[PDB]
Amino acid sequence: LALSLTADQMVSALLDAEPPILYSESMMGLLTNLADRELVHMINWAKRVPGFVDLTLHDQVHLLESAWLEILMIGLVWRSMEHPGKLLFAPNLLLDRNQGKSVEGMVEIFDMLLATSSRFRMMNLQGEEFVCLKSIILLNSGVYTFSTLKSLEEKDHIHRVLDKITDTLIHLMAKAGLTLQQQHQRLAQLLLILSHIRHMSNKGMEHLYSM
Amino acid sequence: LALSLTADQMVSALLDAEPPILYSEYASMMGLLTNLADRELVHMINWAKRVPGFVDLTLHDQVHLLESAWLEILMIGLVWRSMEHPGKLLFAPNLLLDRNQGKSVEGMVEIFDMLLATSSRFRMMNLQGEEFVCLKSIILLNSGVYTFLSSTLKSLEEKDHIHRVLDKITDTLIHLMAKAGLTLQQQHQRLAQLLLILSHIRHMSNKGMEHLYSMKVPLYDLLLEMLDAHRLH
Numbered sequence: 001l002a003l004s005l006t007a008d009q010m011v012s013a014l015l016d017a018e019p020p021i022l023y024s025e026s027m028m029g030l031l032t033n034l035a036d037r038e039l040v041h042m043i044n045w046a047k048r049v050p051g052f053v054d055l056t057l058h059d060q061v062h063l064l065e066s067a068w069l070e071i072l073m074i075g076l077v078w079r080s081m082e083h084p085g086k087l088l089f090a091p092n093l094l095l096d097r098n099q100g101k102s103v104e105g106m107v108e109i110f111d112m113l114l115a116t117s118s119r120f121r122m123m124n125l126q127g128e129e130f131v132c133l134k135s136i137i138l139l140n141s142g143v144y145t146f147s148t149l150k151s152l153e154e155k156d157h158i159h160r161v162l163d164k165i166t167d168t169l170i171h172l173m174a175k176a177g178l179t180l181q182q183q184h185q186r187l188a189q190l191l192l193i194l195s196h197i198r199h200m201s202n203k204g205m206e207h208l209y210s211m
Numbered sequence: 212l213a214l215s216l217t218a219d220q221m222v223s224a225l226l227d228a229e230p231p232i233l234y235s236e237y238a239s240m241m242g243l244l245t246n247l248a249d250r251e252l253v254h255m256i257n258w259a260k261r262v263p264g265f266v267d268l269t270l271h272d273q274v275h276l277l278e279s280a281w282l283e284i285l286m287i288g289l290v291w292r293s294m295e296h297p298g299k300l301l302f303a304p305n306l307l308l309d310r311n312q313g314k315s316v317e318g319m320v321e322i323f324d325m326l327l328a329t330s331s332r333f334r335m336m337n338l339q340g341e342e343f344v345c346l347k348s349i350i351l352l353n354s355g356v357y358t359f360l361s362s363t364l365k366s367l368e369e370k371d372h373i374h375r376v377l378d379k380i381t382d383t384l385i386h387l388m389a390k391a392g393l394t395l396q397q398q399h400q401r402l403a404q405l406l407l408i409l410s411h412i413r414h415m416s417n418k419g420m421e422h423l424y425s426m427k428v429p430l431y432d433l434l435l436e437m438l439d440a441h442r443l444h
């Protein structure tokens with residue numbers, strides 16, 4: 001099981017499961033089409049996340065239905081890091097704030113995504129940390145919304161895996177040369193950003209469902 | 212000055228700052244819940260002003276943070292006092308409601324279930340009072356930090372301060388866990404478990420806002436009115 005993997009094995013498995021960066025094939029049309037194609041790759045990526053396939057199909061579907069937008073958004077923010085002021089939806093679709101005003105209700109979300117990307121840049125987020133965070137989102141997002149006996153076991157499994165990913169993040173920070181205090185401070189800084197990603201996803205859904 | 216406090220002083224400060232538990236007044240379930248939340252807001256501002264470092268910020272930034280986090284703060288408070296009442300939500304000592312009593316208002320039951328699950332999680336983790344106050348302060352400082360308007364030197368200075376205080380609370384959380392006898396690995400694991408729940412609290416607040424808006428002076432001006440006090444008294 002995933003509970004037996006080592007910190008380096010975890011990082012390795014995660015880096016390998018990384019989906020491909022797709023290209024865009026009016027604006028909403030392009031964003032949703034892109035999202036639709038990425039979803040297919042997300043599902044394959046998910047199954048590769050240590051511990052995911054150990055859950056019931058029903059629960060696998062639940063976690064994905066709950067975390068897909070947060071997962072797409074953290075990916076967007078990650079590839080937009082080296083591009084201050086712009087969101088790299090796709091290599092051939094790099095948009096700025098003004099282009100966001102185009103659609104209604106869209107710029108407010110663009111601004112939050114931009115701010116998040118800036119925070120990651122400021123923190124100098126590493127690719128190893130990024131994959132860990134994305135996996136955390138997948139497992140954490142829908143766990144608080146699955147009282148049956150079967151649920152107990154599922155949740156227990158999820159939490160153990162999450163603990164493993166936490167150890168991995170800490171491990172990465174240790175090898176990076178951070179002091180213990182710096183380590184736990186960065187761990188918290190990174191997890192607190194997940195709350196903002198949840199927020200952006202909620203708003204993204206409000207914007208999506210509003211049309 | 213808040214950045215020089217020790218872990219123990221940080222904890223004592225937060226504990227001392229705790230707001231009072233209000234009673235429901237008296238039925239319109241929403242009327243009761245909203246009136247209760249309205250009266251608690253007044254006390255929330257007093258509590259916020261007592262959170263180390265909060266008053267060093269500008270009035271504008273203080274209002275923005277509270278406008279962003281008020282419902283999360285009310286909800287974590289609710290979940291906290293509901294910990295000893297499995298299956299029920301203790302909105303107030305005289306307003307303990309169960310799941311079915313939530314079906315009396317469309318779209319309320321889904322939120323109730325989320326709050327109830329959060330309460331069970333806290334109970335399952337044996338959340339400590341010292342940890343609860345640290346978490347509530349983190350919500351206050353973190354929820355709206357990523358949505359600050361300007362990027363002026365002043366703004367950059369405020370964000371630096373907020374992140375510095377947040378690091379301090381993180382230090383305090385780890386200190387509490389260390390004194391509890393947990394190993395370093397258990398400390399890091401619990402810290403993560405606690406912070407991930409804030410993601411769920413953020414989620415509930417958003418669903419709560421959507422619900423509140425389904426049943427519509429702007430909140431900002433109301434918070435500003437109360438935060439912008441004079442010194443004649």
Ligand SMILES: Oc1ccc([C@@H]2Oc3cccc(O)c3[C@@H]3CCC[C@@H]32)cc1
Nearest residue numbers: 031034035072073076106109204207208
């Ligand atoms: O990889 C990605 C990441 C984000 C997007 C897009 O992000 C945004 C951002 C702002 C407003 C939106 O409606 C969307 C839509 C809503 C669904 C997602 C899609 C598309 C592809």
Ligand SMILES: Oc1ccc([C@@H]2Oc3cccc(O)c3[C@@H]3CCC[C@@H]32)cc1
Nearest residue numbers: 244247248285286289319322419422423
């Ligand atoms: O201390 C507290 C905590 C929560 C509440 C109530 O919590 C809920 C829960 C579910 C649906 C709601 O509309 C509310 C309303 C929306 C505003 C808050 C209020 C009231 C007082």
